[PDB]
């Protein structure tokens, strides 16, 4: 009654038979912007089912020596489908999200993934190691796209913040012994009712294996991690010609 | 189209290849119209 | 109008934010109720699942035999205003006689509280903070001596002309707020409102402020939030000639009416740059101290 | 429900029985393609093995949503996730997941 | 739910089609009322503006001095069923003894009413037509003589197996409707319903039936509407041996329960192909007759 | 009170000071598909303001020897903006239109344009002149795109139908002496509640100068004709990957 | 596995609209399907055979 | 609550811990013949518990290359116990059935059995391969007895009917991953209120492995399939001397 679940939105349906309940980010469901909070005067467009659907963006292979990966939102969808088209044609952006991470193994595999959502996850550079060099992460690292990016130092999350305290953010654990999926529902987290879907990344999703994957030789060595996500209550405003980046 | 979402994961001591059986049917709003002749005639010569 | 069912019954426009939780008053710590030995099957408070991502709700009574304790310990001092409304150093201005930094008798200090780790670690605990500010300016010579010198502190909002010299026309302060105090007087103290264009200051801005290609020359724009650029602080020695005394000015900030959102993990690495989460890549140190073995203390 | 001959590649008598089911196995985890088939019930192809398709062969016009259920016949210890996508008319065969 | 004003007050979902006009009964032509000389300024019925795109509404009374005429002329014969419910030739099937067209004693006639201009010009006046059909099959030898020959008319819906020979297994007609008549009998007459998948037949389909590149080989697919492919008509001489008499079969169609939409300009050029609006490019002739000069009749 | 008009829809506004009233195609305003007429079961998307706006697609130059031009709908917008993106991503299509043709001249210019909307305007070929050749118009002629296409024989409209009877369709006249704009509002005209926005062209717009343009030498010789149009009550259904043609 | 056809509906899988289905099921009935004359036997009466 | 079941009838009890519900053939429980349907005038005998009991008739070994087996009813019991004695001594016959197929394996075995009940399952011959030979199946094939018979061409079920459409009959699936038993309750299926229990076979039970059995070497290679069945509401009429065939 809590291990089996089915999430349907738009024209896509995601099922699961070994779920571990659903986390609502900060105990708040996604909702449309209230008229007392909106600041733009133009009437926003609400395409509804054409954008509020589960997008399966990429598949990452979990290995015994993996460090972890992170994705930026809504960067991952800035170039995907009708949602990406609307985000390119419209200046303003507002939506929630429903992130479903899939990672399935057998009863003889072991390992634990920490799936967390960190708002305004600003990536820092290693500052040339010693710290005397004022470097900045490249565009391909600050906005990795749909491929995500592999963490270099997951202990500090490449941002000087320990991962041991990452659980203060909305998070779920994919421990292969019990559950093979993590569901996090994240409302719009920003200091503004609307923001640019290209320049600003509202939050970053982190998938870091805390307990290394292990299995005896002979079992299936390819354990993929697949990210599936669906915007919720998406709004757009400030239409103009399309902008690619 | 059927795509592998993540993988087919199996432990040591179990078959590496598994088969899927597909069953097809129609929903309760399914209707048919314009009854026509059969597309296949199961007969070659005269049925003796 | 609306005639189709998918529009009539549509939930589009429901702007109420369904909140699964509601704030409840808690002036003191929770009381501990009497518990007794409990030997039953099927029901188990001890076994939980951190897998879900929720903190375990097991209580003292459900694990061990407890007594009745009326907890009267107040939780007032852990509130946001109690934790943050303590003045701390946020900026230092040096006004030397002969030097290369500010030999002109004036100095422009871009307002930012990220220059000192003591304040930065506290403020950086939350992603969004909305508060008022109270700034106190303690000025003295490098020997700690007070001298009869008259100074002018000018608040220069973003877009206002930045003074370029001690006798610049910008010092006429016909519109900008200015404070004229002497070092013999008590430190100047003013209250600053919440001036951000956004509804709350954001210490971390995971984005860029302008469109276009972000090349090497246009690479310092990452992490810079224009909604936090509250302006520049201009200080000068009020006079036409050079001041007789060298001055060092320390600016202490104390937040009040504080509101905070989105807690994040506290920093555990040495800070390197203002408005930049960069850390020493080769010198990543553990959050806590270490020990020789796990089986010994 | 009737068995849908999705894997209708074989033609020889000794292996006509394997047309009823199609295999899955451990893969490289890149979202590869497993099987495709058209959704037309009265059209020549996989749907001819179904009673629904055989009956729709007797009727020129059909209207209504169809339902397809896939039964996994693997071992109890074998797990995995598969994505089954229906492409509305007009779009070609998807190149990738 | 709906909490924002732009959603609450939104007209999205209003499926009612606002119609500025409503049909009014008109069994007879409009009466003419008495009119008198009218000499006034400012108000002018004679001057109109065809610029707007609306037909001028000036009446007889508003232009000349008219009498009172009670018009009892009925408008019944100009209705759709009165205009269209007259049988006319739509297809002809030839069944020769020795020939190259159908020497096998059978012929498959793809059902289409565009093969004869008399019917085509009438039906092509409207873009969309929804009607029932009544088909009469007049069969005779080329000399107009009736002969004791037994024929079979089979209706082959789209997708049904097309017969390939006079003794083909498809003639068992276990599901298809078939008519067995002799030439000595009166012509066979059956009623055919509205079998299109669309809500109405469309004589002009400005589009393609399938996606992909429309090259030279895939170029005949333009203008072909699958929603009008009602099937094939199969006729054969009922026997194993060749028929003694040559036969020509004429199929007459008569619409009934006709509904029409979207009138279009009537054709004014010679027809060239079935299901194709192609016209002789070099032989474009004027719609009407010509005269030597405009100032003379 | 009838010569000045302003049409506003979406985020675009079109004004006119020499209008000649507004023609509603067949006396019927565009409306959403009723639940008793819809046949698709998926919930359609109604992007509203992001697609229901005035698009200025191209400008044609009227000359003393011009034959006329025609455009196909919604072909002209299959590759324009958020409307084109939605038409590419969605199989089904339903919308009305509001076509505003602009053609402005001076009080010393003369000429008359016939602006008409002909549903299912099937273009035929010249059949090799004599009529013995079974030709078909090329793709660039049956689906001209946003550039339209110049009629070869406007008397038969390249389809064997006289233009003298074209006024039976919703039409307006741009006679330069009085009006410089023609406004036609066309509801969805099809035998189906929904249809493909790429394969099927619901109607074609014809702009044919019946009275040739004339002016004494010295006046402005460039008299442009600009087509501006706005979909009304647009619906889309059957989302899949984008299809370019 | 049970041997019963899956009862999942359109509404329980994808976001659907409200469609009033008026398509008649009369033509799929037994009499409509079977009450069409078809060949069942042929008798040959030759002169010499 | 649906996986564990216990069937008790007569003096026999069958239990199961991995059941997959119970299929009632055509949604109709076995019942005695009504007085408005009976045609014989003699009072039928209803031995009740002496015949309505679970008979375990034979055990078949499932192999990786097995084609399938079928049994004929009530042929399988014409020579078993008091039921067989009554069927031999009485001309008329009427009963329902409750067929319980047992096939148990481990969690590392895989395979799927299709257990179906096909009324009036007439077995045809291969007609000499080409089809020019008018053969008939032997007595040992049309009435195999309690040993059943192995199908030669399970695709056509040795009767020219595809097995892909066999699921239209009352059926259950024994997929070793979930369930190890199939329960089908079949009422009396005939055009007559009574019939001969020797000459006429009311229905045939088919057990055909659709997905071949598989397992890694080392596991138990003998996977038996055992058929257990119990007549329900059995009636007999027309007593005379016993008839063996
Ligand atoms: C006498 C006038 C003093 C005016 C004081 C204005 C202070 C306003 C309070 C907030 C100041 C911004 C603090 C720093 C914000 C961000 O961390 C940085 N801008 C990072 O870019
Ligand atoms: C004895 C059986 C006779 C069956 C008669 C069926 C006739 C159905 C009436 C409409 C037939 C279609 C008429 C032609 C339509 C279009 O103009 C062409 N298909 C153009 O492609």
Q: What is the CATH number of the domain that holds F215?
A: 2.60.120.20
Which residue of B lies nearest to G28 if distances are taken between CA atoms? B32
* Residue C105 half-sphere exposure toward CB, CA atoms < 13 A: 18
Which residues neighbour B24 within 8 Å (Cβ) at sequence distance 6 or greater?
A: D1, D2, D4, D41, D47, D50, D52, D53, D66, D67, D68, D69
Question: How does DSSP classify residue C82?
Answer: H
- Are the C-beta atoms of C264 and C127 separated by less than 8 Å? yes
Q: D-contacting residues of G 13-32, CB under 8 Å?
A: 23, 27-28
CA H104 to chain centre: 18
How many angstroms is the resolution?
Answer: 3.3
Residue C191: count of CB within 10 angstroms of its CB:
10
At CA H241, angle to CA H238 and CA H242, rounded to 5? 100
Assess B1–A contact: CB distance below 8 Å, yes or no.
no
User: Nearest CA to C1 among F136, F34, G32?
Assistant: F34
Angle between helices A81-89 and F81-89 (to 10 degrees): 180
Helix, strand, coil % (nearest 5) of chain E?
Answer: 10, 25, 65
- Are the C-beta atoms of C256 and C80 separated by less than 8 Å? no
- Are the C-beta atoms of D57 and D44 separated by less than 8 Å? no
How long, in residues, is chain F? Answer: 245
Q: How far is CA A172 from CA A72, A167, C18, C104, in A?
A: 18, 8, 21, 57
Residues G20 and F210: their CA atoms lie apart, in Å, by 47
Tracing tokens 């309760």 back to the chain, one arrives at B28
Residues H41 and F142: their CA atoms lie apart, in Å, by 82
Which of D29, D41, D94 has the CB atom closest to B1's CB atom? D94
Q: How far is E178 from chain G (nearest CA, A)?
A: 8
For H197, the token pair is 């229990």
CA torsion D6-D12-D16-D18 (nearest 10°) is: -60
**Contact residues of ligand 2, CB 6 A cut-off:** E 111-114, 133, 135, 153, 155, 190, 192, 195, 201, 203, 224-225, 228-230, 233, 275
Residues A166 and A206: their CA atoms lie apart, in Å, by 9
Residue E162: count of CB within 10 angstroms of its CB:
15
Residue H118 lies in a domain: yes
Residue H57: count of CB within 10 angstroms of its CB:
17
Residues A54 and A11: their CA atoms lie apart, in Å, by 8
Specify burial of residue E90 (Cβ count, 10 A radius: 0-12, 13-18, 19+). buried
Which residues neighbour G44 within 8 Å (Cβ) at sequence distance 6 or greater?
A: none
What H25-29 contacts at long range (C-beta under 8 Å, 24+ apart), as own/partner pairs, is H25/H117, H25/H170, H25/H184, H25/H185, H25/H186, H25/H187, H25/H189, H26/H170, H26/H187, H26/H189, H28/H187, H29/H96, H29/H185, H29/H187, H29/H232
**If you measure from the C-alpha of residue C135 to the centroid of ligand 1, how many angstroms do you get, rounded to a whole number?**
11
Residues C230 and A20: their CA atoms lie apart, in Å, by 45
Q: How far is CA C46 from CA A153, A179, C57, E147, in A?
A: 35, 20, 9, 100
Residues H41 and E179: their CA atoms lie apart, in Å, by 51
CB-CB neighbors (< 8 A) of G18 in chain F: 35, 38
Q: F178-187 burial string, b = 16+ CB within 10 Å, else e?
A: ebbbbbbbbb
Residue A214 lies in a domain: yes
Q: How far is CA E38 from CA E33, E48, E62, E63, in A?
A: 15, 18, 8, 9
Residues F145 and F75: their CA atoms lie apart, in Å, by 6
How long, in residues, is chain E? Answer: 297
For F36, the token pair is 């008793």
Residues C254 and C89: their CA atoms lie apart, in Å, by 9
Helix, strand, coil % (nearest 5) of chain A?
Answer: 15, 40, 45
Which residues neighbour C43 within 8 Å (Cβ) at sequence distance 6 or greater?
A: none
Tracing tokens 């070659």 back to the chain, one arrives at B44
Residues D20 and D3: their CA atoms lie apart, in Å, by 7
Residues C260 and A147: their CA atoms lie apart, in Å, by 33
Residues C228 and C201: their CA atoms lie apart, in Å, by 6
Which of G8, G23, G28 has the CB atom closest to D67's CB atom? G8
Phi, psi for residue H22 in degrees, rounded to 5? -125, 130
- Are the C-beta atoms of B25 and D52 separated by less than 8 Å? yes
- Using the beta-carbon criterion (under 8 Å), do G3 and H178 form an inter-chain contact? no
Structural domain boundaries enclosing A16: 5-239
Residues H197 and C119: their CA atoms lie apart, in Å, by 96
Query: Using a 6 Å cutoff on CB, does residue C192 contact ligand 1?
Result: yes
Residue H245 lies in a domain: no
Specify burial of residue C184 (Cβ count, 10 A radius: 0-12, 13-18, 19+). exposed
Which residues neighbour F94 within 8 Å (Cβ) at sequence distance 6 or greater?
A: F32, F33, F44, F188, F193, F194, F195, F233, F234, F235, F236
Q: How far is B13 from chain A (nearest CA, A)?
A: 8
CA torsion E45-E49-E54-E59 (nearest 10°) is: 20
- Using the beta-carbon criterion (under 8 Å), do D79 and A59 form an inter-chain contact? no
Q: Report the domain count for chain H.
A: 1
Assess D63–G contact: CB distance below 8 Å, yes or no.
yes
For C167, the token pair is 């006798």
Three-state SS for E96? Answer: coil
Residues of E near B (Cβ–Cβ under 8 Å) read 156-157, 159-161, 169-170, 172-176, 195
- The residues facing H179 across adjacent strands are none
Q: E235-274 burial string, b = 16+ CB within 10 Å, else e?
A: bbbeeeeebebbbbbebbbbbeebebbbebbebbbebbbe
> In which element (H, E) is residue H84 found?
helix H81-89
Specify burial of residue A51 (Cβ count, 10 A radius: 0-12, 13-18, 19+). buried
Assess G12–A contact: CB distance below 8 Å, yes or no.
yes
Which residues neighbour F63 within 8 Å (Cβ) at sequence distance 6 or greater?
A: F213, F223
Assess A56–B contact: CB distance below 8 Å, yes or no.
yes
Q: How far is CA C89 from CA C78, C113, C134, C248, F198, in A?
A: 21, 8, 12, 13, 66
- Are the C-beta atoms of H79 and H131 separated by less than 8 Å? no
Question: How would you classify residue B34: left for phi > 0, otherwise alpha for psi between -120 and 50, otherwise beta?
Answer: left
Which residues neighbour C259 within 8 Å (Cβ) at sequence distance 6 or greater?
A: C80, C129, C130, C131, C200
Q: How far is B41 from chain D (nearest CA, A)?
A: 12
Three-state SS for B33? Answer: strand
Specify burial of residue D73 (Cβ count, 10 A radius: 0-12, 13-18, 19+). buried
Residue H244: count of CB within 10 angstroms of its CB:
7
- Are the C-beta atoms of C222 and C212 separated by less than 8 Å? no
- Are the C-beta atoms of F120 and F200 separated by less than 8 Å? no
Q: Where are the beta strands (DSSP E) in chain A?
A: 5-9, 12-16, 22-24, 55-62, 69-73, 90-102, 110-119, 149-150, 171-175, 181-186, 195-196, 203-214, 223-239
CB-CB neighbors (< 8 A) of D59 in chain G: 27-28
The sign of the torsion formed by the CA atoms of A81, A82, A88, A92 equals: negative
Residue A245 lies in a domain: no
For C260, the token pair is 């905070």
CB-CB neighbors (< 8 A) of F34 in chain C: 3-4
Residue E43: count of CB within 10 angstroms of its CB:
7
> In which element (H, E) is residue C252 found?
strand C247-263
Ligand 1 atom with the shortest distance to the CA of C133: 9
Three-state SS for E279? Answer: coil
Tracing tokens 């059956």 back to the chain, one arrives at E190
For F27, the token pair is 């006396």
For A66, the token pair is 């993996």
Specify burial of residue E27 (Cβ count, 10 A radius: 0-12, 13-18, 19+). exposed
Residues F179 and F3: their CA atoms lie apart, in Å, by 8
CA F7 to chain centre: 17
Residue F244 lies in a domain: no
Q: How far is CA F64 from CA A225, C239, F150, F209, F214, in A?
A: 68, 80, 14, 9, 6
**If you measure from the C-alpha of residue C133 to the centroid of ligand 1, how many angstroms do you get, rounded to a whole number?**
9
Pure H helices in chain C: 5-8, 80-84, 117-123
Pocket test for ligand 2, best of E114, E124, E154, E234 (most atoms within 8 A of CB): E114
Ligand 1 atom with the shortest distance to the CA of C223: 21
Residue F52 lies in a domain: yes
Residues A229 and A207: their CA atoms lie apart, in Å, by 14
Which residues neighbour H199 within 8 Å (Cβ) at sequence distance 6 or greater?
A: none
Three-state SS for F187? Answer: coil
Q: How far is E17 from chain C (nearest CA, A)?
A: 10
- Are the C-beta atoms of A100 and A229 separated by less than 8 Å? yes
User: Strand pairing of H149-150 and H22-24?
Assistant: unpaired
Query: Using a 6 Å cutoff on CB, does residue C134 contact ligand 1?
Result: no
Greatest alpha-carbon pair distance for chain F in Å reads 62
The experimental method, as deposited, was cryo-EM
Residue H244 lies in a domain: no
User: Nearest CA to E194 among E111, E119, E256?
Assistant: E256
Pure H helices in chain E: 5-8, 80-84, 117-123
For F220, the token pair is 């402005």
Residues E107 and E243: their CA atoms lie apart, in Å, by 14
Residues G34 and F3: their CA atoms lie apart, in Å, by 67
Query: Using a 6 Å cutoff on CB, does residue C225 contact ligand 1?
Result: yes
- Are the C-beta atoms of H234 and H46 separated by less than 8 Å? yes
Residues E260 and E123: their CA atoms lie apart, in Å, by 9
User: Nearest CA to F156 among F167, F165, F143, F169?
Assistant: F165
Q: How far is A218 from chain C (nearest CA, A)?
A: 28
- Are the C-beta atoms of F27 and A27 separated by less than 8 Å? no
Pure H helices in chain F: 81-89, 139-142
- The residues facing A15 across adjacent strands are A6
For H141, the token pair is 């094939």
Which of G5, G10, G33 has the CB atom closest to D1's CB atom? G5
Residues H91 and H87: their CA atoms lie apart, in Å, by 7
Which residues neighbour C174 within 8 Å (Cβ) at sequence distance 6 or greater?
A: none
User: Nearest CA to A226 among A52, A110, A100, A98?
Assistant: A100
Q: How far is CA E159 from CA E156, F2, F48, in A?
A: 8, 56, 41
Helix, strand, coil % (nearest 5) of chain C?
Answer: 10, 25, 65
Write down the number of H helices and E strands in chain C. 3, 9
- Using the beta-carbon criterion (under 8 Å), do D75 and B10 form an inter-chain contact? yes
Cis peptide before F74 (omega within 30 of 0): yes
- Using the beta-carbon criterion (under 8 Å), do A239 and F90 form an inter-chain contact? no
Residues C63 and C59: their CA atoms lie apart, in Å, by 7
For H186, the token pair is 């079949």
Tracing tokens 């209250």 back to the chain, one arrives at C191
Tracing tokens 């469309």 back to the chain, one arrives at E202
Residues D51 and H166: their CA atoms lie apart, in Å, by 9
Residues H208 and D3: their CA atoms lie apart, in Å, by 13
Question: How does DSSP classify residue B19?
Answer: E
Three-state SS for A87? Answer: helix
For F53, the token pair is 């706006």
Greatest alpha-carbon pair distance for chain E in Å reads 88
Phi, psi for residue H146 in degrees, rounded to 5? -80, -15
User: Strand pairing of A22-24 and A181-186?
Assistant: parallel
First to last CA, chain G: 60
Residues E33 and E65: their CA atoms lie apart, in Å, by 10
Phi, psi for residue C237 in degrees, rounded to 5? -85, 120
Specify burial of residue H156 (Cβ count, 10 A radius: 0-12, 13-18, 19+). middle
For D26, the token pair is 């451990």
- Are the C-beta atoms of B25 and H116 separated by less than 8 Å? no
Tracing tokens 């009374």 back to the chain, one arrives at E61
Residues F2 and F18: their CA atoms lie apart, in Å, by 9
Tracing tokens 């939980």 back to the chain, one arrives at C48
Residue A172 lies in a domain: yes
At CA B29, angle to CA B28 and CA B32, rounded to 5? 110
Q: G27-38 burial string, b = 16+ CB within 10 Å, else e?
A: ebeeeeeeeeee
């Amino acid at each position: 009654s809590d291990r089996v679940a089915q999430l349907t939105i738009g024209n896509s349906t995601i099922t699961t038979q070994e779920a571990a309940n659903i986390i609502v980010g900060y105990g708040e469901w996604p909702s449309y912007c209230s008229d007392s909070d909106a600041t733009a005067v133009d009437k926003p467009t609400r395409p509804d089912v054409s954008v509020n659907r589960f997008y399966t963006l990429d598949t990452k292979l979990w290995e015994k020596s993996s460090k972890g990966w992170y994705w930026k939102f809504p960067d991952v969808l800035t170039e995907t489908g009708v949602f990406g088209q609307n985000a390119q044609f419209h200046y303003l952006y507002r939506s929630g999200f429903c992130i479903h991470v899939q990672c399935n193994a057998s009863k003889f595999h072991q390992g634990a993934l920490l799936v967390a959502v960190l708002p305004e996850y600003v990536i820092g550079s290693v500052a040339g190691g010693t710290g005397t060099e004022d470097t900045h992460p490249p565009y391909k690292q600050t906005q990795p796209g749909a491929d995500g990016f592999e963490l270099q130092h997951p202990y500090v999350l490449d941002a000087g913040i320990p991962i041991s305290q990452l659980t203060v953010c909305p998070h779920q654990w994919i421990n292969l012994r019990t559950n093979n999926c993590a569901t996090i529902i994240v409302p719009y987290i920003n200091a503004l009712p609307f923001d640019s879907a290209l320049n600003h990344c509202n939050f970053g999703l982190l998938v870091v294996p805390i307990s290394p994957l292990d299995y005896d030789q002979g079992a299936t060595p390819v354990i993929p991690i697949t990210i599936t996500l669906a915007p919720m209550c998406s709004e757009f405003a400030g239409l103009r010609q399309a902008v690619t980046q | 189209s059927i795509w592998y979402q993540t993988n087919y994961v199996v432990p040591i001591g179990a078959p590496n290849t598994a088969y899927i059986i597909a069953l097809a049917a129609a929903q309760k709003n399914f209707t048919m119209k314009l009854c026509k002749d059969a597309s296949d005639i199961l007969q070659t010569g005269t049925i003796q | 109008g609306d005639r189709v069912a998918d529009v009539i019954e549509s939930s589009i426009g429901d702007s109420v934010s369904r909140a699964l939780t509601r704030a409840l008053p808690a002036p003191t710590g929770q009381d501990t109720q009497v518990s007794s030995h409990r030997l039953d099957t099927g029901k188990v408070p001890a076994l939980q699942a951190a897998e879900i991502g929720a903190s375990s709700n097991a209580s003292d009574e459900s694990m061990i035999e407890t007594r009745c304790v009326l907890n009267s310990h107040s939780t007032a001092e852990t509130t946001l205003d109690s934790f943050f409304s303590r003045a701390g150093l946020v900026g230092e201005i040096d006004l030397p006689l002969e030097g290369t930094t500010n030999p002109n008798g004036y100095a422009n200090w871009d307002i930012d509280i990220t220059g000192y780790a003591q304040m930065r670690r506290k403020v950086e605990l939350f992603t969004y903070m909305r508060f008022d500010a109270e700034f106190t300016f303690v000025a003295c010579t490098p020997t700690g001596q007070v001298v009869p010198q008259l100074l002018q502190y000018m608040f220069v909002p973003p877009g206002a002309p930045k003074p370029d010299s001690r006798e610049s026309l910008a010092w006429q302060t016909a519109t900008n707020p200015s404070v004229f105090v002497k070092l013999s007087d008590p430190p100047a103290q003013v209250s600053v409102p919440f001036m951000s264009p956004a509804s709350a200051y954001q210490w971390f801005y995971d984005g860029y402020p302008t469109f276009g290609e972000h090349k090497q020359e246009k690479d310092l724009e990452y992490g810079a939030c224009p909604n936090n650029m509250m302006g520049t602080f201009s200080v000068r020695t009020v006079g036409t000639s050079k001041s007789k005394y060298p001055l060092v000015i320390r600016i202490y900030m104390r937040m009040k009416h504080v509101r905070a959102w989105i807690p994040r993990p506290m920093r555990n690495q040495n800070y390197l740059f203002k408005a930049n989460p960069n850390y020493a890549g080769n010198f990543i140190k553990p959050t806590g101290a270490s020990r020789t073995a796990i089986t010994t203390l | 429900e009737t068995i849908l001959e999705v894997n209708n590649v074989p033609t020889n008598a000794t292996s006509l029985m394997e047309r009823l089911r199609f295999p899955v196995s451990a893969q490289a985890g890149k979202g590869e393609l497993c099987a495709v088939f058209r959704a037309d019930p009265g059209r020549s192809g996989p749907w001819q093995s179904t009673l629904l398709g055989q009956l729709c062969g007797y009727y020129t016009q059909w209207s209504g949503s169809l339902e397809v259920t896939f039964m996994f016949t693997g071992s109890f210890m074998a797990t995995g996730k598969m994505l089954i996508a229906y492409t509305p008319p007009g779009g070609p065969l998807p190149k990738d997941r």
